[PDB]
Amino acid sequence: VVEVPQVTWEDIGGLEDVKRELQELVQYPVEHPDKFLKFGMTPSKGVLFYGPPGCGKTLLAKAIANECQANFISIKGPELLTSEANVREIFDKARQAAPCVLFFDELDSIAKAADRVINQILTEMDGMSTKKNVFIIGATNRPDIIDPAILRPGRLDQLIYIPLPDEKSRVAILKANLRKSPVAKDVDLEFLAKMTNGFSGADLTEICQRACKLAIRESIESEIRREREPVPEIRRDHFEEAMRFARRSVSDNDIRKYEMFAQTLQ
Numbered sequence: 001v002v003e004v005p006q007v008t009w010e011d012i013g014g015l016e017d018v019k020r021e022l023q024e025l026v027q028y029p030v031e032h033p034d035k036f037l038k039f040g041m042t043p044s045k046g047v048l049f050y051g052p053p054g055c056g057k058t059l060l061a062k063a064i065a066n067e068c069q070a071n072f073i074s075i076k077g078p079e080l081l082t083s084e085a086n087v088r089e090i091f092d093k094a095r096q097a098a099p100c101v102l103f104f105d106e107l108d109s110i111a112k113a114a115d116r117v118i119n120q121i122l123t124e125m126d127g128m129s130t131k132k133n134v135f136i137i138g139a140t141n142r143p144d145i146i147d148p149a150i151l152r153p154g155r156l157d158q159l160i161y162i163p164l165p166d167e168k169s170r171v172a173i174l175k176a177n178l179r180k181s182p183v184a185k186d187v188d189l190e191f192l193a194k195m196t197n198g199f200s201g202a203d204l205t206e207i208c209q210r211a212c213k214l215a216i217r218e219s220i221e222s223e224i225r226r227e228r229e230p231v232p233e234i235r236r237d238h239f240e241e242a243m244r245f246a247r248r249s250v251s252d253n254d255i256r257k258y259e260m261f262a263q264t265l266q
C-alpha cells in the first residue's frame, strides 16, 4: 500500500543535527523559491543513510515523506530478485504516485546479473529530472561496499551517518516512545538511559513494549479478581521486570567498524 506516513520528527529521539539538515533539504526549494531561481540551484534527488541496525534510518525516510505530504513506497533489496524491468516498473509507480518518497532498504544485500539491477537503477535515476517530484532514499549497514557511482553529482547528493544513540539520545528515544502512554512518576528514564550503554533505538523500544504489556496484563488479572467481590500506569517495577530480557543487538566489534568508517570521513 502507498500512503502518506504518520511518523513525524517528534517520534524520533536524538539525531537533531540530521533532522535540521533534512528539513532544510526539503523545505528550502519550496520556502525560498525566488532565491533558488536567482542562483540556478536544483533541488536534491536523494540521500543515502548508513549505520548500525535499528537506529532510525527507516523512521527518517518516513518522516521526510510526512514533512512533504508525500506518498511513501518501500522496497527491500532482496525482493528485486526473480528481471531488470523490475527496476523500471517501480520507478513508474513512484512517478505515478508523485509527490513520492522512494526508499530502497537493505541495499547491502545487493552490494553482495545483480551487477546491473544496480545499473538499471543508475539509469532510471539519470532519466528522472527533479521536476518529477520523486525523492530517492537508500539505506545500508555495509558502508564499506558502497559503489561510489551512486554518489556522483546528479544522483544521491549526501551520505549521512546514523549512529547508535548516546546517553542524551537514549533519554529522548525513551520519551518519544512513551509520549502518549501513562507512565508513573516513580520511573526515572535518565537512570534507564545510563544503564543501557550500547543499546540501539530498537532495543530501547522493546523494553518499552514489554513494560506496557506487563501493566496491561496486570490490569486484566486484577479486575478479573475484583470481579469476585482510573487509567492504570506503567510503573517502575514493570520496567524492572522488562530489563531482565534486555541485551544489546549490536556487537562492540561492529561499533568499532562503524566508528572507524565515519571518523576517517572526518
Ligand SMILES: Nc1ncnc2c1ncn2[C@@H]1O[C@H](COP(=O)(O)OP(=O)(O)O)[C@@H](O)[C@H]1O
Binding pocket: 011, 012, 013, 014, 015, 052, 053, 054, 055, 056, 057, 058, 059, 060, 139, 173, 176, 177, 200, 201, 202, 203, 205
Ligand atoms: N531514533 C529513534 N527514535 C525513536 N525510536 C527509534 C529510533 N531508532 C529506532 N527506533 C525504534 O526502532 C525501530 C526500528 O527503527 P528503524 O528506523 O526501522 O531502524 P533502521 O535504522 O534499521 O531503519 C523503530 O520502529 C522504533 O521503534
Ligand SMILES: CN1CCN(C(=O)c2ccc(F)c(F)c2)CC1
Binding pocket: 141, 142, 143, 144, 254, 255, 257, 258, 259, 261
Ligand atoms: C552484518 N554484520 C556482519 C558484517 N558486517 C561488517 O562487516 C561491517 C560492520 C560495520 C561497518 F561499519 C562495516 F563497514 C562493516 C556488518 C554486521
Ligand code: NA
Binding pocket: 051, 052, 053, 054, 140, 141
Ligand atoms: Na540497518
